[PDB]
Ligand binder design. Structure first.
Ligand SMILES: C#Cc1c(F)ccc2cc(O)cc(-c3ncc4c(N5CCC[C@@](C)(O)C5)nc(OC[C@@]56CCCN5CC(=C(F)F)C6)nc4c3F)c12
Ligand SMILES: Nc1nc2c(ncn2[C@@H]2O[C@H](COP(=O)(O)OP(=O)(O)O)[C@@H](O)[C@H]2O)c(=O)[nH]1
Ligand SMILES: [Mg+2]
Length: 170
């Protein structure tokens, strides 16, 4: 049987969560994917010769807390925490997303990757030092992505899978 990995993509509206997920699954860049659609997508990919079936939750919608949303997020094995390099507020928000993951996982050691998306854009307000300092504080990898050019997309998802394996057997 394939090995299943439950991945969850989190961050502010507009950072590129859907664009990154669609690049991974469909190998194209979507300009305008409905900002309100939250769904789980499946990708079969071989990583270090293991056939993986990724279950990727592309988050969306309102800021709502419930036992049922808590429990859904608790089943996540690994999280991509995405901000956009031209969105200071999305970066500032990362501490909150990590706090919510740590709360439902009741752990400081949750497989996570910090993803700085939209690296193709010229209007950079979050410098790489800010990103690297935050990831080092959390003890997690940082990787710059462009969903537009596809730079870093495979790297972000494969690295998260490897972080999950390092944490737990699969
Ligand atoms: C996301 C998320 C999330 C986790 F990563 C882990 C466990 C969670 C448990 C929960 O019950 C709920 C969530 C969750 N759901 C939605 C969430 C959501 N919305 C609106 C912005 C776009 C969206 C896709 O992130 C959905 N937004 C926020 O925080 C939004 C901010 C901005 C305005 C004030 N909020 C707090 C904040 C800071 F910086 F203090 C960021 N968190 C969510 C959340 F924790 C969990
Ligand atoms: N230039 C550029 N635009 C992007 C990138 N990723 C997403 N976008 C655009 O930013 C907007 C929001 O992306 P979306 O994936 O809908 O964000 P989400 O709200 O986090 O799902 C869309 O117009 C995307 O085309 C990227 O890496 N570079
Ligand atoms: Mg989206």
């Amino acid at each position: 049987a394939m090995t299943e990995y439950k991945l969850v993509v989190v961050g502010a509206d507009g950072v590129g969560k859907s664009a990154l997920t669609i690049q991974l699954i469909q190998n194209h860049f979507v300009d305008e994917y409905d900002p309100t659609i939250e769904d789980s997508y499946r990708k079969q990919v071989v990583i270090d010769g293991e056939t993986c079936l990724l279950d990727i939750l592309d988050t969306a919608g309102q800021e709502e807390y419930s036992a049922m949303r808590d429990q859904y997020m608790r089943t996540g094995e690994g999280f991509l925490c995405v901000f956009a390099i031209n969105n200071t507020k999305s970066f500032e928000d990362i501490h909150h997303y990590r706090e919510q993951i740590k709360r439902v996982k009741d752990s400081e050691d949750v497989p996570m990757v910090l993803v700085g998306n939209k690296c193709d854009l010229p209007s950079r307000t979050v410098d790489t030092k800010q990103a690297q300092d935050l990831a080092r504080s959390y003890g997690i990898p940082f990787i710059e992505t462009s969903a537009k050019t596809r730079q870093g997309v495979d790297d972000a998802f494969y690295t998260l899978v490897r972080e999950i394996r390092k944490h737990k057997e699969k």
